[PDB]
Amino acid sequence: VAFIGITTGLLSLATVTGNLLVLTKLKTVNNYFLLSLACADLIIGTFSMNLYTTYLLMGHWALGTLACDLWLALDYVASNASVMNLLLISFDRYFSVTRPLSYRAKRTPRRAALMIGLAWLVSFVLWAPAILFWQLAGQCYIQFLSQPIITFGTAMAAFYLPVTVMCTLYWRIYRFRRRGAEALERAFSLEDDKEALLAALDALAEAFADDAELTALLALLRRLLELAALRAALTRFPEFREALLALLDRADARDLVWALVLAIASDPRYRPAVAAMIAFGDAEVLRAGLLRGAEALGLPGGEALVEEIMAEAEKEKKAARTLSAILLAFILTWTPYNIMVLVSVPETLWELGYWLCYVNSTININPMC
Ligand SMILES: CN1[C@@H]2CC[C@H]1C[C@H](OC(=O)[C@H](CO)c1ccccc1)C2
């Protein structure tokens, strides 16, 4: 009777005052995609939470008609915007992993802040006029969907399909990066080996697929390790041909590949693809292998590459867990309501599940720190 108001009263203040906090550069496209999630969470956590607080009364619902439509429209627009923005984030991560050169290079604040606008527009148009322009005593529900079949269909379409897409994409990127990290780890863990030695090159080839040139080089090196353009292909590496071709005289291929990885990671154009696999690696075996490659290169200037690559690796580990925290929170909190729609329980649990989709808001901004 009194704890209901307190829990949903402080959460709104902990969310609204916890969401205006994220609103000084930080122009990373990840932050651009998180901005819309933060705005939708703010709108929810203030308007929908307060109106549900006022709904949970002995008079069924106060301020009917107009407010019963306005609150419903705001809730069902902001929730769809949040789901579609999470889908956008997941697809962005998947394409950044899969196409690190064709697509990851062309990620700019423009042409990515336009995909954000389409996320809201295809959601606002679908949900706002469908109920606000559709024209019990206090009951407030979307009259345009007063049926069990309709609610099951909308729940499926707006939750399970995006959820299965997100899980498939996250699992795919996790496996794609994990296999490369394992192969790279075995490249140094086992010495005088051929299987792991070729596996490292295979993982490098799979990582770089959007340029064809780097792939051609990896195919050439695979053929060499088991014609005369080996030097011409290696000429793409500046200030590195003399050392690398020296190791190409002739076993010794363990030092050649580890030297090749450092040289590939040098150019910022195709660095992040290597940085991802390094980030999901053991951080010790890969560091030792990279140091071995640097020492096999002859150390022209020094170990000026290993230090910041690990810095870029950990800056990728933070972005990997942040996606997990936001996605996992959405999966856990929204599930109780969308399993209740599956079984179609008293109103004492329908309202308990309805506000469980609002506690997703407060835990959304915590990973942003
Ligand atoms: C209606 N509210 C309450 C609290 C927030 C919102 C969503 C929750 O219900 C759902 O998850 C459906 C699909 O099941 C849904 C509706 C709009 C957009 C995406 C998904 C319950």
mmCIF file of all heavy atoms in Angstrom, residues 36-85, unseen atoms left out:
data_model
loop_
_atom_site.group_PDB
_atom_site.id
_atom_site.type_symbol
_atom_site.label_atom_id
_atom_site.label_comp_id
_atom_site.label_asym_id
_atom_site.label_seq_id
_atom_site.Cartn_x
_atom_site.Cartn_y
_atom_site.Cartn_z
ATOM 1 N N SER A 36 20.054 8.066 -28.164
ATOM 2 C CA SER A 36 18.627 7.835 -28.365
ATOM 3 C C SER A 36 18.066 6.887 -27.313
ATOM 4 O O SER A 36 16.933 7.068 -26.848
ATOM 5 C CB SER A 36 18.376 7.294 -29.768
ATOM 6 O OG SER A 36 18.879 8.188 -30.743
ATOM 7 N N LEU A 37 18.837 5.867 -26.934
ATOM 8 C CA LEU A 37 18.416 4.987 -25.851
ATOM 9 C C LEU A 37 18.235 5.769 -24.559
ATOM 10 O O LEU A 37 17.248 5.575 -23.841
ATOM 11 C CB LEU A 37 19.436 3.867 -25.657
ATOM 12 C CG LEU A 37 18.979 2.446 -25.976
ATOM 13 C CD1 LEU A 37 20.117 1.465 -25.776
ATOM 14 C CD2 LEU A 37 17.795 2.073 -25.111
ATOM 15 N N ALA A 38 19.170 6.671 -24.258
ATOM 16 C CA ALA A 38 19.057 7.486 -23.054
ATOM 17 C C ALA A 38 17.828 8.387 -23.103
ATOM 18 O O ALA A 38 17.115 8.527 -22.106
ATOM 19 C CB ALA A 38 20.324 8.314 -22.862
ATOM 20 N N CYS A 39 17.565 9.007 -24.255
ATOM 21 C CA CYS A 39 16.407 9.892 -24.367
ATOM 22 C C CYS A 39 15.097 9.126 -24.206
ATOM 23 O O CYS A 39 14.183 9.580 -23.502
ATOM 24 C CB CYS A 39 16.436 10.628 -25.705
ATOM 25 S SG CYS A 39 17.721 11.891 -25.834
ATOM 26 N N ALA A 40 14.982 7.964 -24.856
ATOM 27 C CA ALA A 40 13.775 7.158 -24.711
ATOM 28 C C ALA A 40 13.597 6.688 -23.275
ATOM 29 O O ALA A 40 12.478 6.687 -22.745
ATOM 30 C CB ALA A 40 13.821 5.965 -25.664
ATOM 31 N N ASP A 41 14.692 6.282 -22.628
ATOM 32 C CA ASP A 41 14.613 5.867 -21.235
ATOM 33 C C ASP A 41 14.178 7.020 -20.343
ATOM 34 O O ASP A 41 13.409 6.822 -19.398
ATOM 35 C CB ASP A 41 15.960 5.310 -20.781
ATOM 36 C CG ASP A 41 16.073 3.817 -21.003
ATOM 37 O OD1 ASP A 41 15.129 3.091 -20.630
ATOM 38 O OD2 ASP A 41 17.104 3.371 -21.548
ATOM 39 N N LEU A 42 14.658 8.232 -20.625
ATOM 40 C CA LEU A 42 14.228 9.397 -19.859
ATOM 41 C C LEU A 42 12.732 9.626 -20.010
ATOM 42 O O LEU A 42 12.015 9.806 -19.017
ATOM 43 C CB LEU A 42 15.018 10.631 -20.302
ATOM 44 C CG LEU A 42 14.637 12.030 -19.810
ATOM 45 C CD1 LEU A 42 15.870 12.909 -19.791
ATOM 46 C CD2 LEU A 42 13.580 12.673 -20.695
ATOM 47 N N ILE A 43 12.245 9.618 -21.254
ATOM 48 C CA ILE A 43 10.824 9.860 -21.504
ATOM 49 C C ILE A 43 9.975 8.829 -20.771
ATOM 50 O O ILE A 43 8.995 9.169 -20.092
ATOM 51 C CB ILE A 43 10.533 9.848 -23.016
ATOM 52 C CG1 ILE A 43 11.071 11.118 -23.675
ATOM 53 C CG2 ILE A 43 9.044 9.701 -23.271
ATOM 54 C CD1 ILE A 43 11.573 10.903 -25.083
ATOM 55 N N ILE A 44 10.347 7.553 -20.894
ATOM 56 C CA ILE A 44 9.640 6.498 -20.176
ATOM 57 C C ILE A 44 9.657 6.784 -18.681
ATOM 58 O O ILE A 44 8.611 7.029 -18.068
ATOM 59 C CB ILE A 44 10.251 5.123 -20.493
ATOM 60 C CG1 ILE A 44 9.766 4.630 -21.850
ATOM 61 C CG2 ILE A 44 9.881 4.113 -19.426
ATOM 62 C CD1 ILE A 44 8.276 4.429 -21.913
ATOM 63 N N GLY A 45 10.857 6.832 -18.096
ATOM 64 C CA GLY A 45 11.022 6.913 -16.659
ATOM 65 C C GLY A 45 10.381 8.121 -16.022
ATOM 66 O O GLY A 45 10.104 8.094 -14.817
ATOM 67 N N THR A 46 10.143 9.190 -16.781
ATOM 68 C CA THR A 46 9.332 10.248 -16.184
ATOM 69 C C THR A 46 7.829 10.156 -16.439
ATOM 70 O O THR A 46 7.038 10.108 -15.489
ATOM 71 C CB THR A 46 9.762 11.642 -16.676
ATOM 72 O OG1 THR A 46 8.807 12.615 -16.237
ATOM 73 C CG2 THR A 46 9.881 11.719 -18.188
ATOM 74 N N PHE A 47 7.423 10.038 -17.704
ATOM 75 C CA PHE A 47 5.997 10.158 -17.978
ATOM 76 C C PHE A 47 5.269 8.853 -17.695
ATOM 77 O O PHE A 47 4.264 8.837 -16.973
ATOM 78 C CB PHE A 47 5.775 10.610 -19.422
ATOM 79 C CG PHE A 47 6.188 12.033 -19.681
ATOM 80 C CD1 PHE A 47 6.237 12.528 -20.971
ATOM 81 C CD2 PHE A 47 6.530 12.873 -18.635
ATOM 82 C CE1 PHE A 47 6.617 13.833 -21.213
ATOM 83 C CE2 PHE A 47 6.912 14.177 -18.871
ATOM 84 C CZ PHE A 47 6.955 14.658 -20.162
ATOM 85 N N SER A 48 5.767 7.743 -18.241
ATOM 86 C CA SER A 48 5.047 6.488 -18.094
ATOM 87 C C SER A 48 5.081 6.004 -16.652
ATOM 88 O O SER A 48 4.079 5.494 -16.137
ATOM 89 C CB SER A 48 5.631 5.439 -19.035
ATOM 90 O OG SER A 48 5.381 5.788 -20.384
ATOM 91 N N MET A 49 6.219 6.175 -15.977
ATOM 92 C CA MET A 49 6.312 5.767 -14.581
ATOM 93 C C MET A 49 5.389 6.596 -13.695
ATOM 94 O O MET A 49 4.695 6.043 -12.833
ATOM 95 C CB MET A 49 7.757 5.868 -14.100
ATOM 96 C CG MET A 49 8.162 4.767 -13.138
ATOM 97 S SD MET A 49 9.951 4.607 -12.978
ATOM 98 C CE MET A 49 10.083 2.949 -12.317
ATOM 99 N N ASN A 50 5.348 7.920 -13.894
ATOM 100 C CA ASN A 50 4.463 8.744 -13.077
ATOM 101 C C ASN A 50 2.998 8.418 -13.340
ATOM 102 O O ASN A 50 2.186 8.358 -12.405
ATOM 103 C CB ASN A 50 4.742 10.223 -13.334
ATOM 104 C CG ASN A 50 6.070 10.667 -12.760
ATOM 105 O OD1 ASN A 50 6.756 9.895 -12.089
ATOM 106 N ND2 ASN A 50 6.441 11.916 -13.019
ATOM 107 N N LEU A 51 2.634 8.200 -14.604
ATOM 108 C CA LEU A 51 1.243 7.879 -14.894
ATOM 109 C C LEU A 51 0.858 6.505 -14.364
ATOM 110 O O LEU A 51 -0.284 6.315 -13.942
ATOM 111 C CB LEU A 51 0.977 7.975 -16.391
ATOM 112 C CG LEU A 51 0.324 9.293 -16.803
ATOM 113 C CD1 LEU A 51 -0.941 9.522 -15.990
ATOM 114 C CD2 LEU A 51 1.292 10.451 -16.625
ATOM 115 N N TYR A 52 1.783 5.544 -14.354
ATOM 116 C CA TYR A 52 1.480 4.261 -13.724
ATOM 117 C C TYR A 52 1.348 4.409 -12.213
ATOM 118 O O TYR A 52 0.521 3.734 -11.582
ATOM 119 C CB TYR A 52 2.556 3.234 -14.069
ATOM 120 C CG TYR A 52 2.011 1.838 -14.202
ATOM 121 C CD1 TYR A 52 0.855 1.598 -14.926
ATOM 122 C CD2 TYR A 52 2.641 0.763 -13.598
ATOM 123 C CE1 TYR A 52 0.342 0.328 -15.053
ATOM 124 C CE2 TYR A 52 2.136 -0.514 -13.717
ATOM 125 C CZ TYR A 52 0.985 -0.725 -14.447
ATOM 126 O OH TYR A 52 0.467 -1.994 -14.576
ATOM 127 N N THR A 53 2.157 5.287 -11.616
ATOM 128 C CA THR A 53 2.017 5.580 -10.195
ATOM 129 C C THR A 53 0.621 6.106 -9.892
ATOM 130 O O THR A 53 -0.030 5.672 -8.935
ATOM 131 C CB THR A 53 3.074 6.598 -9.768
ATOM 132 O OG1 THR A 53 4.352 5.959 -9.690
ATOM 133 C CG2 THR A 53 2.732 7.195 -8.413
ATOM 134 N N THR A 54 0.140 7.039 -10.716
ATOM 135 C CA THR A 54 -1.210 7.562 -10.524
ATOM 136 C C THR A 54 -2.275 6.523 -10.855
ATOM 137 O O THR A 54 -3.373 6.563 -10.289
ATOM 138 C CB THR A 54 -1.422 8.817 -11.369
ATOM 139 O OG1 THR A 54 -1.194 8.508 -12.750
ATOM 140 C CG2 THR A 54 -0.471 9.926 -10.927
ATOM 141 N N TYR A 55 -1.985 5.605 -11.778
ATOM 142 C CA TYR A 55 -2.940 4.550 -12.099
ATOM 143 C C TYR A 55 -3.142 3.610 -10.923
ATOM 144 O O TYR A 55 -4.270 3.190 -10.644
ATOM 145 C CB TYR A 55 -2.474 3.762 -13.324
ATOM 146 C CG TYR A 55 -3.241 2.472 -13.541
ATOM 147 C CD1 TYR A 55 -4.441 2.464 -14.236
ATOM 148 C CD2 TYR A 55 -2.766 1.264 -13.048
ATOM 149 C CE1 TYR A 55 -5.145 1.295 -14.435
ATOM 150 C CE2 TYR A 55 -3.463 0.092 -13.238
ATOM 151 C CZ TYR A 55 -4.651 0.112 -13.933
ATOM 152 O OH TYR A 55 -5.350 -1.055 -14.130
ATOM 153 N N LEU A 56 -2.064 3.264 -10.222
ATOM 154 C CA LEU A 56 -2.187 2.290 -9.143
ATOM 155 C C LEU A 56 -2.926 2.904 -7.959
ATOM 156 O O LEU A 56 -2.321 3.212 -6.928
ATOM 157 C CB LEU A 56 -0.813 1.770 -8.713
ATOM 158 C CG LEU A 56 -0.091 0.847 -9.702
ATOM 159 C CD1 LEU A 56 1.353 0.625 -9.286
ATOM 160 C CD2 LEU A 56 -0.820 -0.481 -9.827
ATOM 161 N N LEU A 57 -4.239 3.069 -8.106
ATOM 162 C CA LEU A 57 -5.079 3.700 -7.099
ATOM 163 C C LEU A 57 -6.375 2.915 -6.979
ATOM 164 O O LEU A 57 -6.630 1.973 -7.734
ATOM 165 C CB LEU A 57 -5.376 5.162 -7.448
ATOM 166 C CG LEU A 57 -4.760 6.271 -6.596
ATOM 167 C CD1 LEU A 57 -3.247 6.309 -6.736
ATOM 168 C CD2 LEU A 57 -5.367 7.612 -6.976
ATOM 169 N N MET A 58 -7.203 3.321 -6.016
ATOM 170 C CA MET A 58 -8.494 2.681 -5.796
ATOM 171 C C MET A 58 -9.587 3.214 -6.712
ATOM 172 O O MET A 58 -10.705 2.687 -6.686
ATOM 173 C CB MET A 58 -8.924 2.848 -4.337
ATOM 174 C CG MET A 58 -9.318 4.265 -3.957
ATOM 175 S SD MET A 58 -7.892 5.344 -3.736
ATOM 176 C CE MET A 58 -6.889 4.344 -2.642
ATOM 177 N N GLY A 59 -9.300 4.238 -7.510
ATOM 178 C CA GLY A 59 -10.274 4.774 -8.438
ATOM 179 C C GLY A 59 -10.010 4.340 -9.863
ATOM 180 O O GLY A 59 -10.289 5.085 -10.808
ATOM 181 N N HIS A 60 -9.447 3.139 -10.018
ATOM 182 C CA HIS A 60 -9.132 2.553 -11.317
ATOM 183 C C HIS A 60 -8.092 3.384 -12.058
ATOM 184 O O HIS A 60 -6.945 2.954 -12.214
ATOM 185 C CB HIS A 60 -10.397 2.393 -12.166
ATOM 186 N N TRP A 61 -8.478 4.573 -12.517
ATOM 187 C CA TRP A 61 -7.562 5.446 -13.241
ATOM 188 C C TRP A 61 -8.121 6.858 -13.222
ATOM 189 O O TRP A 61 -9.289 7.067 -13.564
ATOM 190 C CB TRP A 61 -7.368 4.964 -14.683
ATOM 191 C CG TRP A 61 -6.862 6.013 -15.633
ATOM 192 C CD1 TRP A 61 -7.601 6.951 -16.292
ATOM 193 C CD2 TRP A 61 -5.508 6.197 -16.064
ATOM 194 N NE1 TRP A 61 -6.788 7.723 -17.083
ATOM 195 C CE2 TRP A 61 -5.499 7.277 -16.961
ATOM 196 C CE3 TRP A 61 -4.303 5.557 -15.768
ATOM 197 C CZ2 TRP A 61 -4.333 7.734 -17.566
ATOM 198 C CZ3 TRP A 61 -3.149 6.011 -16.368
ATOM 199 C CH2 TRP A 61 -3.171 7.087 -17.256
ATOM 200 N N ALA A 62 -7.290 7.818 -12.831
ATOM 201 C CA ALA A 62 -7.677 9.221 -12.837
ATOM 202 C C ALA A 62 -7.297 9.859 -14.165
ATOM 203 O O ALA A 62 -6.398 9.379 -14.861
ATOM 204 C CB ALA A 62 -7.011 9.970 -11.683
ATOM 205 N N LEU A 63 -7.991 10.948 -14.510
ATOM 206 C CA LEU A 63 -7.743 11.688 -15.744
ATOM 207 C C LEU A 63 -7.892 10.798 -16.972
ATOM 208 O O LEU A 63 -6.914 10.546 -17.680
ATOM 209 C CB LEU A 63 -6.350 12.329 -15.729
ATOM 210 C CG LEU A 63 -5.775 12.835 -14.404
ATOM 211 C CD1 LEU A 63 -4.320 13.234 -14.581
ATOM 212 C CD2 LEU A 63 -6.593 13.997 -13.867
ATOM 213 N N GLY A 64 -9.097 10.313 -17.234
ATOM 214 C CA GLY A 64 -9.324 9.408 -18.341
ATOM 215 C C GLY A 64 -9.287 10.095 -19.692
ATOM 216 O O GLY A 64 -8.926 11.268 -19.821
ATOM 217 N N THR A 65 -9.676 9.333 -20.718
ATOM 218 C CA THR A 65 -9.761 9.792 -22.103
ATOM 219 C C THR A 65 -8.449 10.380 -22.614
ATOM 220 O O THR A 65 -7.578 9.645 -23.091
ATOM 221 C CB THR A 65 -10.889 10.815 -22.265
ATOM 222 O OG1 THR A 65 -10.596 11.991 -21.500
ATOM 223 C CG2 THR A 65 -12.212 10.224 -21.797
ATOM 224 N N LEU A 66 -8.317 11.706 -22.548
ATOM 225 C CA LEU A 66 -7.169 12.402 -23.119
ATOM 226 C C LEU A 66 -5.847 11.911 -22.540
ATOM 227 O O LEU A 66 -4.929 11.570 -23.292
ATOM 228 C CB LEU A 66 -7.302 13.911 -22.904
ATOM 229 N N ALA A 67 -5.733 11.869 -21.212
ATOM 230 C CA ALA A 67 -4.488 11.408 -20.606
ATOM 231 C C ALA A 67 -4.307 9.906 -20.789
ATOM 232 O O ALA A 67 -3.183 9.429 -20.985
ATOM 233 C CB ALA A 67 -4.447 11.783 -19.126
ATOM 234 N N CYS A 68 -5.402 9.144 -20.734
ATOM 235 C CA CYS A 68 -5.328 7.709 -20.985
ATOM 236 C C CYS A 68 -4.805 7.400 -22.379
ATOM 237 O O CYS A 68 -4.227 6.331 -22.592
ATOM 238 C CB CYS A 68 -6.704 7.069 -20.787
ATOM 239 S SG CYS A 68 -6.794 5.283 -21.098
ATOM 240 N N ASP A 69 -4.989 8.310 -23.332
ATOM 241 C CA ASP A 69 -4.416 8.152 -24.662
ATOM 242 C C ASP A 69 -3.008 8.720 -24.773
ATOM 243 O O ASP A 69 -2.149 8.112 -25.417
ATOM 244 C CB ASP A 69 -5.316 8.813 -25.708
ATOM 245 C CG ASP A 69 -6.572 8.017 -25.973
ATOM 246 O OD1 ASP A 69 -6.483 6.773 -26.017
ATOM 247 O OD2 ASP A 69 -7.645 8.634 -26.135
ATOM 248 N N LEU A 70 -2.750 9.868 -24.147
ATOM 249 C CA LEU A 70 -1.429 10.481 -24.235
ATOM 250 C C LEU A 70 -0.367 9.603 -23.582
ATOM 251 O O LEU A 70 0.697 9.362 -24.165
ATOM 252 C CB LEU A 70 -1.453 11.868 -23.595
ATOM 253 C CG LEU A 70 -0.171 12.703 -23.654
ATOM 254 C CD1 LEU A 70 0.457 12.646 -25.034
ATOM 255 C CD2 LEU A 70 -0.459 14.141 -23.258
ATOM 256 N N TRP A 71 -0.638 9.116 -22.367
ATOM 257 C CA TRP A 71 0.338 8.272 -21.685
ATOM 258 C C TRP A 71 0.586 6.987 -22.459
ATOM 259 O O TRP A 71 1.733 6.544 -22.595
ATOM 260 C CB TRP A 71 -0.135 7.955 -20.268
ATOM 261 C CG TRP A 71 0.512 6.734 -19.687
ATOM 262 C CD1 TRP A 71 1.813 6.602 -19.307
ATOM 263 C CD2 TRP A 71 -0.113 5.472 -19.422
ATOM 264 N NE1 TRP A 71 2.039 5.339 -18.816
ATOM 265 C CE2 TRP A 71 0.872 4.625 -18.878
ATOM 266 C CE3 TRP A 71 -1.409 4.975 -19.590
ATOM 267 C CZ2 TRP A 71 0.603 3.313 -18.503
ATOM 268 C CZ3 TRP A 71 -1.672 3.673 -19.215
ATOM 269 C CH2 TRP A 71 -0.673 2.857 -18.679
ATOM 270 N N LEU A 72 -0.480 6.377 -22.974
ATOM 271 C CA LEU A 72 -0.337 5.148 -23.743
ATOM 272 C C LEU A 72 0.497 5.376 -24.996
ATOM 273 O O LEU A 72 1.374 4.566 -25.325
ATOM 274 C CB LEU A 72 -1.719 4.612 -24.104
ATOM 275 C CG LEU A 72 -1.979 3.121 -23.949
ATOM 276 C CD1 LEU A 72 -1.398 2.615 -22.647
ATOM 277 C CD2 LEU A 72 -3.470 2.884 -23.985
ATOM 278 N N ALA A 73 0.243 6.480 -25.705
ATOM 279 C CA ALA A 73 1.007 6.778 -26.910
ATOM 280 C C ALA A 73 2.476 7.006 -26.588
ATOM 281 O O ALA A 73 3.357 6.475 -27.273
ATOM 282 C CB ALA A 73 0.418 7.997 -27.615
ATOM 283 N N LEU A 74 2.760 7.786 -25.542
ATOM 284 C CA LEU A 74 4.149 8.042 -25.178
ATOM 285 C C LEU A 74 4.863 6.752 -24.801
ATOM 286 O O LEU A 74 5.996 6.507 -25.234
ATOM 287 C CB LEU A 74 4.217 9.045 -24.027
ATOM 288 C CG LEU A 74 3.704 10.452 -24.331
ATOM 289 C CD1 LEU A 74 3.690 11.303 -23.074
ATOM 290 C CD2 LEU A 74 4.540 11.102 -25.415
ATOM 291 N N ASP A 75 4.203 5.901 -24.013
ATOM 292 C CA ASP A 75 4.810 4.644 -23.595
ATOM 293 C C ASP A 75 5.107 3.749 -24.791
ATOM 294 O O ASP A 75 6.229 3.251 -24.946
ATOM 295 C CB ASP A 75 3.886 3.939 -22.605
ATOM 296 C CG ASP A 75 4.453 2.638 -22.100
ATOM 297 O OD1 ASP A 75 5.680 2.441 -22.206
ATOM 298 O OD2 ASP A 75 3.670 1.809 -21.589
ATOM 299 N N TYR A 76 4.112 3.538 -25.655
ATOM 300 C CA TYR A 76 4.266 2.609 -26.766
ATOM 301 C C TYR A 76 5.088 3.175 -27.914
ATOM 302 O O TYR A 76 5.444 2.420 -28.823
ATOM 303 C CB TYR A 76 2.895 2.180 -27.284
ATOM 304 C CG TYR A 76 2.361 0.938 -26.620
ATOM 305 C CD1 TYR A 76 1.630 1.016 -25.447
ATOM 306 C CD2 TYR A 76 2.584 -0.313 -27.169
ATOM 307 C CE1 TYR A 76 1.136 -0.118 -24.840
ATOM 308 C CE2 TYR A 76 2.095 -1.452 -26.569
ATOM 309 C CZ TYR A 76 1.373 -1.351 -25.405
ATOM 310 O OH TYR A 76 0.886 -2.489 -24.805
ATOM 311 N N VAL A 77 5.382 4.470 -27.911
ATOM 312 C CA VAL A 77 6.344 5.014 -28.862
ATOM 313 C C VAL A 77 7.763 4.916 -28.322
ATOM 314 O O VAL A 77 8.681 4.489 -29.031
ATOM 315 C CB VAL A 77 5.973 6.469 -29.216
ATOM 316 C CG1 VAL A 77 7.149 7.174 -29.865
ATOM 317 C CG2 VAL A 77 4.769 6.497 -30.133
ATOM 318 N N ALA A 78 7.967 5.291 -27.055
ATOM 319 C CA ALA A 78 9.307 5.256 -26.487
ATOM 320 C C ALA A 78 9.829 3.830 -26.359
ATOM 321 O O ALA A 78 11.019 3.582 -26.582
ATOM 322 C CB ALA A 78 9.319 5.960 -25.133
ATOM 323 N N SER A 79 8.965 2.875 -26.003
ATOM 324 C CA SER A 79 9.425 1.493 -25.883
ATOM 325 C C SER A 79 9.857 0.931 -27.232
ATOM 326 O O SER A 79 10.890 0.254 -27.331
ATOM 327 C CB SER A 79 8.333 0.628 -25.265
ATOM 328 O OG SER A 79 8.295 0.806 -23.862
ATOM 329 N N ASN A 80 9.081 1.198 -28.281
ATOM 330 C CA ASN A 80 9.467 0.739 -29.610
ATOM 331 C C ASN A 80 10.742 1.424 -30.079
ATOM 332 O O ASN A 80 11.588 0.794 -30.724
ATOM 333 C CB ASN A 80 8.334 0.975 -30.602
ATOM 334 C CG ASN A 80 8.208 -0.143 -31.606
ATOM 335 O OD1 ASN A 80 8.619 -1.271 -31.346
ATOM 336 N ND2 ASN A 80 7.644 0.163 -32.766
ATOM 337 N N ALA A 81 10.898 2.714 -29.771
ATOM 338 C CA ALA A 81 12.139 3.398 -30.115
ATOM 339 C C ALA A 81 13.329 2.757 -29.416
ATOM 340 O O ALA A 81 14.391 2.586 -30.020
ATOM 341 C CB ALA A 81 12.041 4.881 -29.761
ATOM 342 N N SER A 82 13.168 2.385 -28.142
ATOM 343 C CA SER A 82 14.250 1.723 -27.419
ATOM 344 C C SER A 82 14.593 0.373 -28.038
ATOM 345 O O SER A 82 15.773 0.041 -28.206
ATOM 346 C CB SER A 82 13.876 1.551 -25.949
ATOM 347 O OG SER A 82 13.930 2.785 -25.258
ATOM 348 N N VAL A 83 13.577 -0.421 -28.383
ATOM 349 C CA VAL A 83 13.839 -1.733 -28.974
ATOM 350 C C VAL A 83 14.561 -1.580 -30.309
ATOM 351 O O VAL A 83 15.553 -2.267 -30.584
ATOM 352 C CB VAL A 83 12.532 -2.531 -29.130
ATOM 353 C CG1 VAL A 83 12.659 -3.542 -30.250
ATOM 354 C CG2 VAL A 83 12.195 -3.234 -27.840
ATOM 355 N N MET A 84 14.084 -0.665 -31.154
ATOM 356 C CA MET A 84 14.705 -0.495 -32.462
ATOM 357 C C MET A 84 16.105 0.092 -32.353
ATOM 358 O O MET A 84 16.977 -0.249 -33.157
ATOM 359 C CB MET A 84 13.822 0.370 -33.357
ATOM 360 C CG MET A 84 12.460 -0.241 -33.601
ATOM 361 S SD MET A 84 11.773 0.156 -35.210
ATOM 362 C CE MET A 84 10.861 -1.344 -35.555
ATOM 363 N N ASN A 85 16.354 0.953 -31.365
ATOM 364 C CA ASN A 85 17.702 1.482 -31.188
ATOM 365 C C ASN A 85 18.654 0.408 -30.679
ATOM 366 O O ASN A 85 19.827 0.379 -31.065
ATOM 367 C CB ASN A 85 17.681 2.675 -30.240
ATOM 368 C CG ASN A 85 18.842 3.606 -30.466
ATOM 369 O OD1 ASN A 85 18.756 4.535 -31.266
ATOM 370 N ND2 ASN A 85 19.944 3.360 -29.770
#
